[PDB]
Write a protein that binds this ligand. Structure first.
Ligand SMILES: Nc1nc2c(c(=O)[nH]1)[n+](Cc1cccc(Cl)c1)cn2[C@@H]1O[C@H](CNc2c(O)c(=O)c2=O)[C@@H](O)[C@H]1O
Lengths: 186, 14
């Protein structure tokens, strides 16, 4: 007779996740400013890492957090990113105080909680850009020609953030980005 | 397979 696992096990996530950090440094390269923080695979280790790091709104201009599935680098030239794109949300400057941190947390919860049902295997990761002209949050998808997966992810994401129906967000392919047109909108 | 509600996750933050 053995101990009941629910009294002592950490709560496991579907996936291992990696949090990355981008440091704004013009003397270094893009590749070398992008660096791993740490990995986690349970709810308890996710909060241990979230609770000691700075909120996005307190970061210096030019920095990014990136949360990607273990094995996928947060750059578009990665094998699981190069045929996909991203649902992009652009925030005005006033949103920095009121929505940035709440949207980014909600975004983290959607990834680690697998909120996109069977299209969750299409999710690669998410990036928040802290910029003086306007912050941006985005969820990256592995294939831009998978219409039904991309469409479902975009719609679920937009209502999870609480965005009003009149506010339109676009999905832009990494290959087109590399003034970008939207393949999809919700 | 392992799916979690937002309110369930937010309960382990503290
Ligand atoms: N080698 C490699 N360099 C990158 C990458 C990248 O994935 N790989 N990215 C991220 C990225 C994500 C999605 C689509 C595109 Cl086109 C680019 C930015 N860079 C470098 O930074 C430049 C623009 N980057 C930034 C923005 O846009 C910002 O905001 C910010 O910072 C790019 O032209 C590259 O020189």
């Amino acid at each position: 007779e053995v101990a009941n696992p629910e009294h002592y096990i950490k709560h496991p996530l579907q996936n291992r996740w990696a949090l990355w950090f981008f440091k704004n440094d013009k003397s270094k390269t893009w590749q070398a400013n992008l660096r791993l923080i740490s990995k986690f695979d349970t709810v308890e280790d996710f909060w241990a890492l979230y609770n000691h790091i700075q909120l996005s709104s307190n970061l210096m201009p030019g920095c990014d957090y990136s949360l990607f599935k273990d094995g996928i680098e947060p750059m578009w030239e990665d094998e699981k990113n190069k045929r996909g794109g991203r649902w992009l949300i652009t925030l005005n400057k006033q949103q920095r105080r009121s929505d940035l941190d709440r949207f980014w947390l909600e975004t983290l919860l959607c990834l680690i909680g697998e909120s996109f049902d069977d299209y969750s295997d299409d999710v690669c990761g998410a990036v928040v850009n802290v910029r003086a002209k306007g912050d941006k949050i985005a969820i990256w998808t592995t294939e831009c020609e998978n219409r039904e997966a991309v469409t479902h992810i975009g719609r679920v994401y937009k209502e999870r953030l609480g965005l009003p129906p009149k506010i339109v967000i676009g999905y832009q392919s990494h290959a087109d980005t590399a003034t970008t047109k939207n393949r999809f909108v919700v | 397979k392992k799916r979690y509600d937002r309110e369930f996750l937010l309960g382990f933050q503290f």
